[PDB]
Design a protein around this ligand. Structure first.
Ligand SMILES: CC(C)[C@H](NS(=O)(=O)c1ccc(-c2ccccc2)cc1)P(=O)(O)C[C@H](C(=O)O)c1cccc(CN)c1
Ligand SMILES: [Zn+2]
Length: 304
């Protein structure tokens, strides 16, 4: 059965998306926005009080298969939304005024593989012509300085950028959805682990975004807010200098589409457990991350 304080396999997350929607139809609708290479359904949950032409914030989890705390966060967020609506003033205002497009697991095929075969798997599970090597790195597969730095052209490598931008069914599905809804989406948030950071553009080059000052101030305030709960310390900055250059990222792509608030989160920890974060840290990790996401949402809402 499903638990918010355990890592759940895909079969369970899928059953959860159906159950949480059917139990909360006045706050959640579920739509499939595509299939993965292996035929799994890429669900998107629209979280919010239904209404005409609402602005939206897009958040995805599970780009990288082994980053299990990412998948866990998207599920946690959805429950927080549904349970506190009408009682917590901020979340109530949030869901009244906008929609959260929550994509709980993008790279489902890779996630299943980390459960069945290889816990440290990262990429998708698509085949590659001319080789037995499997998979593309989804966060190198977007049309953002595609494959120009920090990415491999070799299908056997963990940062393989693919045969072309959006060569993967999963990344094409996400990009298509965001393109089809550009006019409503005001912020893009993508959840990874680990490192305890909040990153913003650019990562494919050392250039800074026009609203660099604003993004820095927003990231700073969000990490401060996060720390108030349990003392967890994040760092923040442009991706290229804060972690390393990496072209083809979804956050840089989203920004260049005109979405002015675009962030990558790297959750706990700093490497003691790394990707294998104990389930006993799921609750604390998600609760503190909630504060940062809500801080950003509050800011974005005020700036429509
Ligand atoms: C641990 C986090 C930082 C992930 N990085 S990782 O490639 O898996 C990795 C994991 C472990 C190590 C490592 C650990 C200890 C010693 C030496 C190396 C080095 C790299 P990531 O979430 O996969 C980082 C992400 C990406 O590579 O797609 C990224 C990188 C740069 C910019 C951005 C923003 N678009 C996002
Ligand atoms: Zn990652």
């Amino acid at each position: 059965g499903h638990s918010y304080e355990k890592y759940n396999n895909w079969e369970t997350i899928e059953a959860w998306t159906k159950q949480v929607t059917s139990e909360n139809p006045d706050l959640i609708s579920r739509t499939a926005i595509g299939t993965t290479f292996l035929g799994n359904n890429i669900y998107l949950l629209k979280v919010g009080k239904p209404g005409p032409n609402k602005p939206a914030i897009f958040m995805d989890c599970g780009f990288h298969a082994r980053e299990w705390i990412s998948h866990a966060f998207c599920q946690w967020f959805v429950r927080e939304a549904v349970l506190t609506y009408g009682y917590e003033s901020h979340m109530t205002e949030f869901l009244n005024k906008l929609d959260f497009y929550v994509l709980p697991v993008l790279n489902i095929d890779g996630y299943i593989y980390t459960w069945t075969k290889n816990r440290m798997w990262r990429k998708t599970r698509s085949t590659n012509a001319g080789t037995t090597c499997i998979g593309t790195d989804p966060n190198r597969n977007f049309d953002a300085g595609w494959c120009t730095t920090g990415a491999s052209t070799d299908p056997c490598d963990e940062t393989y950028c693919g045969s072309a931008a959006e060569s993967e069914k999963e990344t094409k599905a996400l990009a298509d959805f965001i393109r089809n809804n550009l006019s409503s989406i005001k912020a893009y948030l993508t959840i990874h682990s680990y490192s305890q950071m909040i990153l913003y553009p650019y990562s494919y080059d050392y250039k800074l975004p026009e609203n660099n000052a604003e993004l820095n101030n927003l990231a700073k305030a969000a990490v401060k807010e996060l720390a108030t709960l349990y003392g967890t310390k994040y760092t923040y900055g442009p991706g290229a200098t804060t972690i390393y250059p990496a072209a083809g990222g979804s956050d840089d792509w989203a920004y260049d589409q005109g979405i002015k608030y675009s962030f990558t989160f790297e959750l706990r920890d700093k490497g003691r457990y790394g990707f294998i974060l104990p389930e006993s840290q799921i609750q604390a990790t998600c609760e503190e991350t909630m504060l940062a996401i809500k801080y950003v949402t509050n800011y974005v809402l005020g700036h429509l």
